[PDB]
Assembly symmetry: C6
Homo-oligomer: 205 residues x 6
Amino acid sequence: PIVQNLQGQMVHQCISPRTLNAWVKVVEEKAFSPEVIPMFSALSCGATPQDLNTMLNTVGGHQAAMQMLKETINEEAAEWDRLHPVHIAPGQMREPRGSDIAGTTSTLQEQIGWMTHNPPIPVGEIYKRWIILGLNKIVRMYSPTSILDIRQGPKEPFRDYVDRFYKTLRAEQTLLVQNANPDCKTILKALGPGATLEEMMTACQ
Amino acid sequence: PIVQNLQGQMVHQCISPRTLNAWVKVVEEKAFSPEVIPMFSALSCGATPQDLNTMLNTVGGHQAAMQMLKETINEEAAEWDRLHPVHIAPGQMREPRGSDIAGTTSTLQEQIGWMTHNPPIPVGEIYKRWIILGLNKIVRMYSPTSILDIRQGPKEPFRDYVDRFYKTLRAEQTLLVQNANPDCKTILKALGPGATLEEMMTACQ
Amino acid sequence: PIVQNLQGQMVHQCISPRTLNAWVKVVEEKAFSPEVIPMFSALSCGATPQDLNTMLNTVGGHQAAMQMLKETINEEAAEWDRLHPVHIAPGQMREPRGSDIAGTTSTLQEQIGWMTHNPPIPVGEIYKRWIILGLNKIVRMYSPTSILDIRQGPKEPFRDYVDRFYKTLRAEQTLLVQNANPDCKTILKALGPGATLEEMMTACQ
Amino acid sequence: PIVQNLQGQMVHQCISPRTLNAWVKVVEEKAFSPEVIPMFSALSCGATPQDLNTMLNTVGGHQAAMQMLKETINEEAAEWDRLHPVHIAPGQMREPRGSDIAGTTSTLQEQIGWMTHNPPIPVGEIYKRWIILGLNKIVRMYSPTSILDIRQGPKEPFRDYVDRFYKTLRAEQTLLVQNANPDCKTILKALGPGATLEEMMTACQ
Amino acid sequence: PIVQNLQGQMVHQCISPRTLNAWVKVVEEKAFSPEVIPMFSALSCGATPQDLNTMLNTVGGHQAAMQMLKETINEEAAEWDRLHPVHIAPGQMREPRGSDIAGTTSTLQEQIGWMTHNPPIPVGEIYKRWIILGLNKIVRMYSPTSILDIRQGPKEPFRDYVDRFYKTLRAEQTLLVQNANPDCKTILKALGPGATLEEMMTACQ
Amino acid sequence: PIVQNLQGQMVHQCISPRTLNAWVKVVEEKAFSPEVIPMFSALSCGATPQDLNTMLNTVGGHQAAMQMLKETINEEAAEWDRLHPVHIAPGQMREPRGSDIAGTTSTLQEQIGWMTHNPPIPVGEIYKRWIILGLNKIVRMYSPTSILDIRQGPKEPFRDYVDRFYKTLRAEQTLLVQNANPDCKTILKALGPGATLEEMMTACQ
C-alpha cells in the first residue's frame, strides 16, 4: 500500500503477511457473507491496484465468483475508457486507462506515480470501487434465501427471528410483523404504527 | 485512526488487521455481555467515523442489534442537527451534520480535516458516544435475568452467588442480603449496618 | 499509555490489542492467583487512569472481586481528598481529586496533562497503587487454604510439598519442618539450625 | 529485502520470521495450487536474490518441483548470459551474470549495490520473474485434471460445477455449456449468445 | 528494558506482552530444563532490575525454586555490600546497594539513572548474573538422574543414548564408552584413543 | 543482532521473542532435515556471536548433535588461530581469536565493536559459517537412507518417487532412471539422452 512515513511523505510499503493471511482466512471462513466486503475494504486500506490484485488472486476457492468479478471489472474499465479517452512525453506521467486502473497493464511505479501525484489520481480507490461493486453482486447472487421465506417459528424467540430477518435483508440488499408468528403478530399489531425495533423486540420478549 | 507520528503531528493510519480481528472475535465470543463495550471503546481509540463503521459493519451476526444501533445513531444524529444547523467557501471546511459525524455522508478526508483542526471538531469521539449509547441499550435488552431472580442456592458458595448478583446488576445497569440463603442471611443480618462487601464475603466464607 | 517517542518527548499512545487480550486472557486462565498482580503491573506500564479502567472493565467474570476493588479505590480516593484538598484559572491545570486519579471525573486530556507536567503529577502510578492494594486483598480473600493445612503426604516428594507450602504462603501473604512427613522431619531435625532451603531440599531428596 | 526507511533512503532489512513462516506454511497447506504463486510474489516484495533463495530453500518437501525449478532458473540464467555478456575496476560495480542474478555467485553486498544503484539494476525482480516462470510450469504439471473431464453432476449445483471448472482452467492455464448437465444445458442453450457468467449462473440457480 | 531509540539515545521501554508471555510459557512447558536459562537471558536483554523481578514474579508455579532463588540473590547482595560499602547530595546519583541492584529498594528512575550513566553502572546485568547463578543451582537440583545411570539399552540406537548422556551431563553441569552396550563398546574400544564424537557415532550407527 | 536504524547507523538490537520461538519450534518440528539450515541462516540475519550462541543454547533436545557442533566449532576456531595469530593499547580494539569469534571469550561490546568497525571485522558471519559447516555434517549424519535404496514402488506415482529421491540426495549432500520401476524405466529409456526432469516426469505421469 501507500502510507505516510514518520516524516510525513507518502511512500510505498509492502503488503504485510498479517494482511495477506487475514484476507485469505476471512474468505475461507465467511465465503461471501455480506460482512466480508467491509473487511475487504478495511484490509485494502491504501492499497495499490497491484495490492488489490494480490488480495483477489491469493483466493484459492470460489473461482466462479472470481470470474464474475473480472466481468464486472472489465465492464467498469470499459465505461472508464468511454468517459476518459487517452491520446508519451519523455519523463512525464501518462493518463491511466481502465486496464491500468485494474493493474493489468500498469507497473507498480506508474501506480505509485498516479496515487502520489499532486493532485492524486487515486487509481487504488477507483479500482477498489469497481471490485466492491462486483463483490456486492456476488453477495447478492450467493444469498440463499428470499426475505419472503424468513418467518418466525412457533417456538422461535423473536430476537432470533429478527436476526435471521435482517441477516437475509443485508445479503439480499410491515413485513417483519407479517412474517412473525401468530402470538407475536397480535402483540405487534396492538402496538400501532411508528413502533421502533427496540419497542417491538421488548413487546415480544 | 488518527495518531501522533514519531515527529509529533496528527496523521491518519490504516486500521490494523489485529484491531479488526480482535473486535470481530470478541463479538463472536462474548456477544453483548457488558464487558464488550469497554473493549469496543479501547479497540476504537483514535477512530475516525469510517473506522467506527468498519468495526460495526464487519460484525456478521446479531443483525437485530445492528439495526437497533442504527435507530439510536439516527436519533442522536437528528438531535445533533436540531442543536447544530448548517447553512461552500472554496477550499474551506464545512460544518458537520449528524450523518457526517456518523460517516455516511462525509469522506475520510473531511473526517481527518475535522479531527485534526485547531481546535479539533472531534467527530470520531462524538460518533463513538452515540454508538456506546446504542450498545448500552442492546446490553440491557439482551440481559437475560432480573436481579430479583438472582438468589443464593442452598449449597452455593457465597462468592459464586455475589458473582452472579453483580454480573446481573452490570447487565441490567440490602437486596444482596435479602436474596442470600437462610444460613448466610442470618450471618449477614448479625453483622449490622455499614458492612462492606469484603466483610460480608468474609463472614459467609 | 504515555510513552517516549523516537524523538524523546512523552506522548499518549493507544492501548494495544495485544495488551488488552493478554490481560483478559490471564484473568480467564489464572483468576486471582498471586502471579496475576505482577502481570497486571507489567501490562499497565505507563498506563493512564483511563487505561487502568479499560483493563479492569474488560474483565467479564469475577464481579464480586471487581465490586470489592471499587470499595478499596473509593477508600484510597477518600484518603487522597483528606490529605489533598482543592479550592479554574483560564487555560491552567487544575489539581486532581481522588475521583480524577481514578479516572471517573477526569478527561484523558487532563490525565495526559498531569502525567506529562514538569514535574509530573503521576496519576497513573498513584491509581495503579490503589488498584494493586485492592487486588492484593482479593488474592488474600480467594486464597483457598491456610498454611497450617499444608502438610507433606506420606509418599509426597519433598519438592512438591515445598511448592505447595510456598504457593500457599504467597497467596496468604520452622513450620516447613513441622508440617513435613515423619521421615523427612527426622532428617530435617538432624540438620540443625540455620539450614538453607537448598540444604533441606537436598537432604530430603 | 530492500525497503524505504522512515527518512526515505533504500536500505536492506532482514527477512522477517513472519514472512519465513508464512511461505513455509502456505506451501505445506496448498502445495502448488495456482494461488500459491501470487502469495509467493507478495511475500517476496522487495526481496533480494538471497531472500528468494532463502524462501525456496526453506521448503522441506516437493524436491522434484524444486529440482525442476532449478532447471528453469538455469535456462533463464543461460539466456541472460547470451543477451548480456560481461568482460574489475577498483571499488566499482561489476555487471551481473545469470548466476549473480540467481544469487549463487553474488554476495548480499553486490545484490544490494545493484538494487540500490541509480538507475537500479533490479536483480531481485529479474530473478523473481524466472522463479515465477518455473513455478507456473510446476502448477501446470501438478494440475490433476483436464478441463475436458470437468462435467456437471446430475444433482450438482451449477455454482459448484462452475467453481470446479474455473479452478481447473486456472491450474491448466462454449465448453462450460457443453460440459453442463442436460437440464442446465437446455436452459443455457435457450439464453442465446453473449450471455454473461452471472446470467448463466442466475438461469441455472 | 533500556534500548537505543531510532535517534541513538538510551531510553526506557515497557516490557512487551510478547516477552512476558514467552517467559511464562517456557517455564510452564520446560520447568527447569537447562535450556530455560539461555532463554531467560535472551528474553531479559536490556532488562532493568524491575523487569527482571517482573519476569520472576509472573511465574505461578515452582515456588520452592523461587524461594531458593531469593536465598541466592540475598547471598550475592550481601557479598556486594561487603565489597561496595556506601556512606544524599541534592539532585545527585546515590551508590547502589545489593537490594537496589535486586530492585527491592530502588525505584525505576534510579535504575534508569544507573544504567544510562556515563560510564554506566550496569545494575540490570549485575542482577541478571545473580539470578542466573541461582537458576543454575535450581537446574542442578532438579536434574533427575546421575550420569552414572545413563547406560545404553541393548536395542537402543547409539544416537539416542548419546542424546540422553549429554542431556544429563548438561543438567548435572571414557564414560560414554564405558556406559555403552556390549556391541557398541567393542566397536568403540577398537577405534582407539582420540576418536571424535562424530567418528564414534558413525562407528556405532 | 546488528541492524540499520531509521537514521542509517548500525546499532545493536535485542534478539526478538519471535525469532527465539521460531528457531526453537523449527528444531522441534524438523530436527535436522536439510531445510532447517537455510531457516537457521535466515533467522540469524545480522546475528552477533552472542545471538548465535543463544539460538544454539536454547535447543533442549539433540545434545549429541550440539556436542558434535562444538567439536566442529573448536576445529574451525583452531584453524582461525593458526592463520590469525595475535600479540592491549588503552581504549583500542583487540584482534579476535577463534574463541572470541565463537563468543565464549568475547563480550557483547567487543563483538559490536568488531562488527561495526570500518572496515567491519564480521565475527557474526565468520561464526555463522563455522556453525553451518557443523550443521551440514549433522544433517548428513542423521540422513536415514542411501540414495541407492530409493527405488520406485510398483504402484508408486513417479512424482512421489522423484520427491523421495531428491529429498534423500539433499540430505546425503542416470540413477533416477535405474532406480525407477520397470514400466517407467522403459518409458525413460525410450526418451534418450539429454531429457530434462520435466520431460521425464511428463513421460511417466
